[PDB]
């Protein structure tokens, strides 16, 4: 019984914990429009709001 308890934790530890991340198969090229958004300033904007 105690060997079972020990091996479940071992299987879990060796499989590892990971963080799921979304994908898209119809995108096999994304640095046809990713490169334009990247590396210069065209710009991501500090959001503000008109007060007067």
Partner 1 sequence: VGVNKDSYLILDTLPSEFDSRVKAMEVDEKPTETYSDVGGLDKQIEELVEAIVLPMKRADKFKDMGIRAPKG
Residues in touch with partner 1 (CB under 8 A): 49-52
Whose structure tokens read 């914990």? 17
Distance CA 15, CA 20 (A): 14
Coil, strand, or helix at residue 29?
coil
The smaller minimum CB distance to partner 1, of residues 18 and 49, is found at 49
Q: Which is nearer to partner 1, 28 or 52 (CB)?
A: 52
CB of 47 to partner 1, least distance (A): 14
Coil vs helix vs strand at 13? helix
CB nearer to partner 1: pick between 5 and 52: 52
């Amino acid at each position: 019984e105690n060997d079972l308890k020990d091996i479940e934790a071992r299987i879990k530890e060796k499989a590892g914990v990971k963080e799921s991340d979304t994908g898209l198969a119809p995108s096999h090229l994304w640095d046809i429009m990713g490169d334009r958004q990247r590396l210069g300033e065209e710009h991501p904007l500090q959001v503000a709001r008109c007060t007067k």
